[PDB]
Design an enzyme around this catalytic site. Sequence first.
Site, short mmCIF file in Angstrom:
data_model
loop_
_atom_site.label_atom_id
_atom_site.label_comp_id
_atom_site.label_asym_id
_atom_site.label_seq_id
_atom_site.Cartn_x
_atom_site.Cartn_y
_atom_site.Cartn_z
N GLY A 48 -38.40 12.06 36.96
CA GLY A 48 -37.54 11.52 36.17
C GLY A 48 -36.28 11.49 37.06
N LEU B 102 -30.79 -0.47 61.17
CA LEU B 102 -31.45 -0.64 59.77
C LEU B 102 -31.32 -2.19 59.39
CD1 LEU B 102 -29.77 2.18 57.69
CD2 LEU B 102 -32.20 2.05 59.09
N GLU C 230 -32.18 -4.54 61.29
CA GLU C 230 -33.18 -5.40 61.76
C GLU C 230 -34.33 -5.18 60.98
OE1 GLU C 230 -32.94 -4.61 65.96
OE2 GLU C 230 -34.76 -5.64 66.65
N1 LIG Z 1 -46.52 12.46 48.16
C1 LIG Z 1 -45.93 13.28 47.64
N2 LIG Z 1 -45.87 13.17 46.05
C2 LIG Z 1 -45.06 14.01 45.26
C3 LIG Z 1 -44.74 15.31 45.82
N3 LIG Z 1 -43.97 15.70 44.78
C4 LIG Z 1 -44.15 15.04 43.80
N4 LIG Z 1 -44.86 13.91 44.03
C5 LIG Z 1 -45.20 13.11 43.09
O1 LIG Z 1 -43.99 12.65 42.45
C6 LIG Z 1 -44.26 12.33 40.93
C7 LIG Z 1 -43.62 13.37 40.14
O2 LIG Z 1 -42.34 13.31 40.31
P1 LIG Z 1 -41.34 14.42 40.96
O3 LIG Z 1 -40.67 13.96 42.41
O4 LIG Z 1 -42.10 15.67 41.38
O5 LIG Z 1 -40.32 14.65 39.84
P2 LIG Z 1 -38.71 14.70 40.35
O6 LIG Z 1 -38.20 13.53 41.10
O7 LIG Z 1 -38.28 15.79 40.79
O8 LIG Z 1 -38.12 14.63 38.68
P3 LIG Z 1 -37.78 15.38 37.52
O9 LIG Z 1 -38.66 14.92 36.31
O10 LIG Z 1 -36.51 15.75 37.24
O11 LIG Z 1 -38.71 16.73 37.97
C8 LIG Z 1 -45.87 12.42 40.69
O12 LIG Z 1 -46.32 11.25 41.02
C9 LIG Z 1 -46.40 13.37 42.00
O13 LIG Z 1 -47.59 12.96 42.42
C10 LIG Z 1 -44.63 15.56 47.14
O14 LIG Z 1 -44.23 16.58 47.84
N5 LIG Z 1 -45.42 14.54 47.91
#
Ligand SMILES: Nc1nc2c(ncn2[C@@H]2O[C@H](COP(=O)(O)OP(=O)(O)OP(=O)(O)O)[C@@H](O)[C@H]2O)c(=O)[nH]1
Lengths: 352, 54, 425, 438
Positions: D144, D252, D254
Amino acid sequence: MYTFVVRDENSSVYAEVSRLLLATGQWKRLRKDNPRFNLMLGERNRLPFGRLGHEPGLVQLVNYYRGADKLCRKASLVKLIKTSPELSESCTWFPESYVIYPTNLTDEREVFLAAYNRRREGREGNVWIAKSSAGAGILISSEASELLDFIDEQGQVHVIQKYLEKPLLLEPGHRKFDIRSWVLVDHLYNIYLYREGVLRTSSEPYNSANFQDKTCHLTNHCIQKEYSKNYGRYEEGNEMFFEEFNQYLMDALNTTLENSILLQIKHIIRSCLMCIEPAISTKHLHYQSFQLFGFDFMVDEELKVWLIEVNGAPACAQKLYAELCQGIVDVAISSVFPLAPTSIFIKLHHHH
Amino acid sequence: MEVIELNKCTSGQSFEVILKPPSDPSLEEIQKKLEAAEERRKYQEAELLKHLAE
Amino acid sequence: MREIVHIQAGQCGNQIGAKFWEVISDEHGIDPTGSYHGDSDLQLERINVYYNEATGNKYVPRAILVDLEPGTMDSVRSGPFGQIFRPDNFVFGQSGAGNNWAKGHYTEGAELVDSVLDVVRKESESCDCLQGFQLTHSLGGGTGSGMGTLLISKIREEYPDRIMNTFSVMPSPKVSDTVVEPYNATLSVHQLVENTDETYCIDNEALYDICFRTLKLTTPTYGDLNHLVSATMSGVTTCLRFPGQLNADLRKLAVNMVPFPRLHFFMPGFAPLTSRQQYRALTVPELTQQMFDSKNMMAACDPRHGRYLTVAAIFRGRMSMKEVDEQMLNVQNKNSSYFVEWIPNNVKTAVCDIPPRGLKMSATFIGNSTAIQELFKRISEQFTAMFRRKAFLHWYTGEGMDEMEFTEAESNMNDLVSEYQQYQD
Amino acid sequence: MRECISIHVGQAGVQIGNACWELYCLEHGIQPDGQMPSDKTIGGGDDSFNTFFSETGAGKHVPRAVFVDLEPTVIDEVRTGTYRQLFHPEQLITGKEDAANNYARGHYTIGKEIIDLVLDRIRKLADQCTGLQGFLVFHSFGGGTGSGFTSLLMERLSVDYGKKSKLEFSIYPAPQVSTAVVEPYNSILTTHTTLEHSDCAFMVDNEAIYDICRRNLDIERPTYTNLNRLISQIVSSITASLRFDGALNVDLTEFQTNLVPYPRIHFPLATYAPVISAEKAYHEQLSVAEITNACFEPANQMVKCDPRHGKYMACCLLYRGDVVPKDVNAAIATIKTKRSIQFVDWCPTGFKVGINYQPPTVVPGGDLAKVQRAVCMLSNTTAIAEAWARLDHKFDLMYAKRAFVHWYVGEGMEEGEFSEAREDMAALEKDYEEVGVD
Ligand SMILES: Nc1nc2c(ncn2[C@@H]2O[C@H](COP(=O)(O)OP(=O)(O)OP(=O)(O)O)[C@@H](O)[C@H]2O)c(=O)[nH]1
Ligand SMILES: Nc1ncnc2c1ncn2[C@@H]1O[C@H](COP(=O)(O)OP(=O)(O)CP(=O)(O)O)[C@@H](O)[C@H]1O
Ligand SMILES: Nc1nc2c(ncn2[C@@H]2O[C@H](COP(=O)(O)OP(=O)(O)O)[C@@H](O)[C@H]2O)c(=O)[nH]1
Ligand SMILES: CCNc1ccc(S(C)(=O)=O)cc1F
Ligand SMILES: CCNc1ccc(S(C)(=O)=O)cc1F
Ligand SMILES: [Ca+2]
Ligand SMILES: [Ca+2]
Ligand SMILES: [Ca+2]
Ligand SMILES: [Mg+2]
Ligand SMILES: [Mg+2]
Ligand SMILES: [Mg+2]
């Protein structure tokens, strides 16, 4: 418990495969929109390949090779043979063909005419045939003027290729025919030729002095059973199987079907499928493909085999549905999803 | 198979190979969106409070 | 610091709430006097979610005990961990509710509700960032049902943007105290449809059948039923109470479990449910098969009678997270006819390393199934069987209620049933 | 020298940021305390690495980075982690409660109340730059915050920095490492509102990273640390040109010039090789032809798709390690005669090649083995449209029932924004098909 979906209700072949799968008591058919499937019996057009192999923990298999249309399209096949060094423009088993776009739309109009004028000047047989994939609309003629004018009256891409004026005629009857070979390519890209083929014969005497009547020139099962009056006279449904046709070649020509024809068919099948292997192989892909192909051949009075076209969704001979369909389940499906001989196929080995 | 614009330095080099020749909302408008959604939240919460007051 | 304020109301609510705090207090290493004596940092990681830290490193549950008669809460204050609760968080009257929803909601309960809100407000004011509320209660009585839903309505008015969660014990004729339970349950269900984000439906009949048939308890008591509920409550809150590869608060869970605002009634369950052949190790396939077995669920609804909108599964203990994914994907890919196909990837799995006391590993099931309509259909039929003859209504009209309010509650729940029925097809 | 400001939004962005700046330090010889012995200009300098690191009078090299999250638990790890000393408190911004996987909550409800604070902290970094190039924005599609607040930030960044390039590193949602169900909504919502604000975006599909970790690194159940250290290698390969002396992708601007001839089609496919397990006894070092050929294996792409059935619009080859041009051209020739590389007729059939002699740096104790040479291929392929099709289809299945829509409307979003965003993706898919298919 394996799961599969059916997305082509008009497939007689995979309707039988679907019927067999359920018979084993180890396959479950899901709604055509359920993504949690192991096997997709996909639609003919616009099969969503991009959505396969993305379900966690599911090994998914589809009965179509993405990209095989290049071989099973009239226009594409001509382009593939001419531009592929594996097949070259000097390919000896494919009739001289040209892609001709209607004038109301590259194009090979001039190149075709140059070869045409050469034949006309050299007293050689200059009879061609025009066709396209948007047909049940075919025209055979010896005048280049009529061939091209027929394509302009249409709006789809056409192809003009040399018409085999010296076809091998079966006796009695003095009649034409074409050979259908079913070929199954599995996920590993093994090429299996169904041992059983069918000759779709014309029940009318071949006449080389009148191409206006297309009933003795076209051996299609729908034309012979609809516009031919001697349908089912010499063989049931104008379908002669290999056992009879092989015996004939021995009594008449003192040769066998294997030596005189089948070697060339196997060679042609291998050449076509090996050529496009790098483009359509699913070896290192997130999903697996297999596909049944219908190869159509012509034989001339010299016992030389000619490739006519390749069908990517062929039907089967009524008497051969059970054997072949079971064969599809054995080598193409159960080979990936094993259940809990003397093969009916002939493996055309090759280098990958 | 031509190589063009080769640039070399102590930490690497770069070049180009050619195999074949060819053939917004303003600051104000964003504020209205943010406030518009904020107003719809207030309207929805007012209807809830009206519901609870009833 | 995502604090949860816990409220327990009425006899059922306070006896189940008591066992809940007994269970998790043991899991977090808190002794009956609020002193920590664990041996792992994972116990204090998210400890503030449910406990307040007082002077001298004391941990006091963020719990409010509500009732309209003193008896049950005197038992709690004399129970095992009775000393752990804040003395001021005991809010009780003397009249009782007479198993009467109108008394808990409109008369007796209205007299006491303000003082309860004073305690709620006092607990909220000391939260760094209040996640939301959870209420434990029954729907078949008067206090937990009538005053509980009144409390929820007043909490929503004061904290409109906080998550409201409940553990609701649904009555059953087989485990019944009075005949008016269908009346009280139907009146409460409408309140919950409007004012809760998630309600875990616990059917006393399912709890009885599990104790009798699976646990082989000849004569189950309310205490035996409460063992199952407290265990279940520990399982569903494991996501929140311990650290892991999941950052989930109540609102995030609701967003992923509740596709439509009114269909927020969950079927919970867990495995193992073993009778005393109790030292055997339970393999992941066994944990996964049982967890999805209807016999292991506490709503007395056959999931094979409806479809799962969403499913969450929490595995506890040191196990093969790889083998878990295989068995979980084996249950789905073997029964996908019971999962709606229009919510992609609607089955999610979480792992927690800390297992429950006395178990090497366990699995907790939380299902949002349209089969829950069977539960509301049972209540509706019992309601209508009496209401058509206006039987026992005088207990309610005597408290100021009118027949029209019963008619509307009946229509509201029949609508809820029709809503589940359209998403099942 | 021109500065680049990195912005890490949400959990995915922040944690990937941790892996990247750790790797940056190990690559540039910066210690966790910010000191850099090799930097002989104390408290100043305009070296290539200064595009990402500023310098205090005491010699500390401070990342030009901002970490933003609506909940503090993820950024609090940075505040107390190994590299807590790199950043100062003003660079780490955390709210009280998150967006609950709700785009509307991060974009409207919470976003409106913190957006001005984030811009102020970014403005501070910009004030240290004598020639800011633009921003690199890391975030997830499904979160979110990563979805909803990022799109808001991108809108405002275009207003406050109209002439600055903005690039994205976006995490495409995969069910194997996600417990959320509404991520298709958030992905499409954020792509619609961010499309006109991002000049170039590198999508990484968690499904791909997950499979590479299981297949190549023999990790039975990869974690976020495993995924992020692999992602940061790819990110470093992509950004190494901005931090090291060179002549390819030096600014950037480029990236758009070399990879995005059509503005909306600005999602290059990344392919990286080799990824070797550190636990291996000792892998046979792969050659230039072998690692280059691996750039056409679907198994090492950041997004699983079939480039054989698309058309290429551009292609960059970024090598690190023992690589000389002679070996690149020889391998490329061999790949033309074996692979199906179909370029669009209005684009030259060619490759831009960059070589950095410093081989890939590996975090001590990490999962990746030290290799003598590696390559990252950036190619703008229509085949990546498969990822939009997949994602758009999941959107349609849920939206037809209006599943979960009330959560978004409840935060002040109009339902019309759903269909508006979906129609924009339908047009994005149409654009890809017009360029790729005949
Ligand atoms: N590759 C990778 N994906 C991540 C990581 N953390 C979360 N995700 C992915 O991000 C998505 C979940 O969103 P988040 O980034 O955790 O949520 P947010 O941006 O903190 O937003 P909130 O809903 O407020 O918590 C899922 O698809 C997870 O698999 C990470 O450390 N590495
Ligand atoms: N160059 C040629 N010389 C001689 N006959 C030819 C020919 N091209 C086509 N035919 C005749 O046309 C028939 C096959 O037509 P074609 O296969 O091109 O159309 P089609 O694809 O609609 C039938 P199908 O796909 O079922 O085999 C054969 O029976 C053959 O006799
Ligand atoms: N599981 C369980 N159910 C209970 C318990 N006590 C009462 N009930 C059920 O709750 C309903 C009676 O409500 P009760 O809590 O006793 O009334 P209240 O004190 O006015 O809220 C009936 O359906 C009982 O079967 C208990 O300790 N455990
Ligand atoms: C004596 C058994 N107790 C118990 C069992 C399971 C669980 S659970 C739902 O797996 O958390 C908690 C328990 F306390
Ligand atoms: C030197 C510290 N490195 C590092 C720290 C955290 C993470 S995380 C769990 O993915 O946020 C990744 C990292 F590479
Ligand atoms: Ca009174
Ligand atoms: Ca310096
Ligand atoms: Ca812009
Ligand atoms: Mg055909
Ligand atoms: Mg009682
Ligand atoms: Mg977050």
